[PDB]
Ligand binder design. Structure first.
Ligand SMILES: CN(C)CC[C@@H](c1ccccc1)n1cc(NC(=O)c2n[nH]c3cc(-c4cn[nH]c4)ccc23)cn1
Length: 239
């Protein structure tokens, strides 16, 4: 990786060793970024900056000089996970797909520890980066919602766990639509009666046990993200 001189600006000398005269300098980098378009949200920005984790799409800064207000995010080379899964359908190995769920779970456990509620955990809100890394984004509809969320809008990290079980299904079914030909009213009726998304072929019986655990009616009966992280980390390293 060669650096063109134009990109470099020398400032001052910062001491000297025997093999190398050191200089403090400014490096002008032309890095790719993703820019989201729109006191009000100024307070939300400085907080999102503190939320730094390798499995979360990083916020770099905000642009406030009038016109549409910008938000500078980390660029994710391969786009959204939902589209990524759909185009490579029938091409994935079960180990690749468990690795994607572990990636999401790592970021979610950090958000749980930080006391941050996602409210929209779905494959479409997750992004694919370098070496098939999955990072969580859009942290600040019924298909992913738990009974307390669709019925009363009672958000908690345990409702994010319900959403995560739906995500795991999307991943293991290689980006299929949950409750495909059902309406938002039909879905509510189905879950309430006790219906659950079927076991996809690429998901082992143990992975499907985890999915149903995320889908228990009582939020207090669902595992925490910290519990899920240890669980999926063991299945990944053992096989
Ligand atoms: C088809 N696809 C596989 C290729 C598209 C790829 C691309 C690469 C280079 C140039 C153009 C397009 N692609 C990469 C992205 N990356 C992102 O979309 C992205 N990268 N970082 C993001 C952050 C947010 C975000 C919104 N709210 N919070 C975070 C939303 C989206 C993103 C999208 N398409």
């Amino acid at each position: 990786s060669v650096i063109d001189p134009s990109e470099l600006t020398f400032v001052q000398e910062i001491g000297s060793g025997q093999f190398g005269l050191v200089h403090l300098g400014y490096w002008l980098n032309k890095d790719k970024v993703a820019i989201k378009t729109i006191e009000d949200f100024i307070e939300e920005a400085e907080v999102m900056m503190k939320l730094s984790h390798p499995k979360l799409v990083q916020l770099y800064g905000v642009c406030l000089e009038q016109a549409p207000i910008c938000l500078v995010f980390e660029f994710m080379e391969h786009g959204c996970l939902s589209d990524y899964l759909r185009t490579q359908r029938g091409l994935f190995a079960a180990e690749t797909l468990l690795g994607m769920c572990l990636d999401v779970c790592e970021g979610m456990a950090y958000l749980e520890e930080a006391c941050v509620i996602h409210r929209d955990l779905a494959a479409r809100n997750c992004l694919v980066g370098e070496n098939q890394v999955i990072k969580v984004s859009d942290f600040g509809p019924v298909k992913w919602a738990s009974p307390e969320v669709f019925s009363f809008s009672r958000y908690s990290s345990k409702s994010d766990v319900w959403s995560f079980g739906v995500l795991m299904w999307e991943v293991f079914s290689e980006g299929k639509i949950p409750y495909e030909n059902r309406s938002n009213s039909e879905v509510v009726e189905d879950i309430s009666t006790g219906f659950r998304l079927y076991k996809p072929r690429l998901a082992s019986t143990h992975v499907y046990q985890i999915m149903n655990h995320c889908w228990k009616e009582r939020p207090e009966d669902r595992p925490a993200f910290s519990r899920l992280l240890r669980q999926l980390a063991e299945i990944a390293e053992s096989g």
